[PDB]
Amino acid sequence: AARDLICAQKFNGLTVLPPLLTDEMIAQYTSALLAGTITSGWTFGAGAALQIPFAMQMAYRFNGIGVTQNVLYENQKLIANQFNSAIGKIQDSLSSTAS
Amino acid sequence: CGKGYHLMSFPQSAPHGVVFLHVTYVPAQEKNFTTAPAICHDGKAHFPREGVFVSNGTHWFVTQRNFYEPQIITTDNTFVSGNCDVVIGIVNNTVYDPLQPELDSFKE
Ligand SMILES: *[C@@H]1O[C@H](CO)[C@@H](O[C@@H]2O[C@H](CO)[C@@H](O)[C@H](O)[C@H]2NC(C)=O)[C@H](O)[C@H]1NC(C)=O
Numbered sequence: 546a547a548r549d550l551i552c553a554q555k556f557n558g559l560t561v562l563p564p565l566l567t568d569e570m571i572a573q574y575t576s577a578l579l580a581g582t583i584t585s586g587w588t589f590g591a592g593a594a595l596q597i598p599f600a601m602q603m604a605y606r607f608n609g610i611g612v613t614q615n616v617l618y619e620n621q622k623l624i625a626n627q628f629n630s631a632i633g634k635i636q637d638s639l640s641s642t643a644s
Numbered sequence: 645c646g647k648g649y650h651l652m653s654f655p656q657s658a659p660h661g662v663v664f665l666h667v668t669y670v671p672a673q674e675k676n677f678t679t680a681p682a683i684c685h686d687g688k689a690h691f692p693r694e695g696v697f698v699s700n701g702t703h704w705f706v707t708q709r710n711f712y713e714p715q716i717i718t719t720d721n722t723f724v725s726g727n728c729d730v731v732i733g734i735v736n737n738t739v740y741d742p743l744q745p746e747l748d749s750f751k752e
């Protein structure tokens with residue numbers, strides 16, 4: 546085709562170096578963090594990862610706010626459906642708006 | 645303030661800087677247990693006050709989260725909220741009442 550801008554930058558002595566960590570390694574780190582925070586809660590960030598069921602972890606996180614844990618166990622389908630709708634809206638917001 | 649659960653920190657001087665000695669608490673020796681969210685006893689659902697329900701294989705205890713010491717499931721360390729058909733994962737266990745032995749002894 547024609548002379549690209551990056552070819553002119555390369556010919557004039559300007560170089561871009563690649564990063565040390567590839568995008569696959571960043572994705573592996575992110576997946577490890579997600580798996581730890583889903584399966585073990587906050588315990589993997591303070592020592593050995595200790596497993597806990599997710600409803601019980603969410604009840605602990607409600608006691609961290611000020612709401613007693615009987616609220617979640619008697620409404621678990623409602624929090625589950627609200628979270629599913631809220632995370633489904635993120636995909637619809639990201640598939641259209643580029644700002 | 646350091647990795648783990650923070651307890652203390654001590655400063656020290658250094659040329660053009662400071663050095664913090666962070667004293668933290670780390671859990672060490674874990675073991676598996678079977679757990680439940682609530683106890684369905686006498687048509688009522690019991691939830692722990694400050695703790696979690698565990699089983700050593702046959703019996704059910706309530707314990708704190710960051711350390712393992714078990715104790716008997718009691719009305720004093722639990723609370724009641726509704727009936728046991730809404731919570732998913734309930735198990736069946738008796739709940740001790742400390743009032744009743746002294747109450748019946750006063751009754752007789
Ligand atoms: C689970 O814990 C309970 C409470 O400590 C155990 O019950 C007691 O176990 C001791 C140890 O042999 C016995 O001497 C007692 O007679 C038991 N008491 C009762 C009321 O059973 C129980 O054995 C433990 N179960 C397992 C599988 O370790």
Ligand SMILES: *[C@@H]1O[C@H](CO)[C@@H](O)[C@H](O)[C@H]1NC(C)=O
Nearest residue numbers: 594595596673674675676677
């Ligand atoms: C708990 O159970 C898992 C799977 O059964 C096993 O790999 C592990 O060694 C057990 N003990 C601890 C302390 O996690």
Ligand SMILES: *[C@@H]1O[C@H](CO)[C@@H](O)[C@H](O)[C@H]1NC(C)=O
Nearest residue numbers: 684685686687734735736737
């Ligand atoms: C617990 O006890 C109730 C009646 O007291 C019974 O209907 C229920 O099936 C029991 N739960 C299990 C898991 O057996």
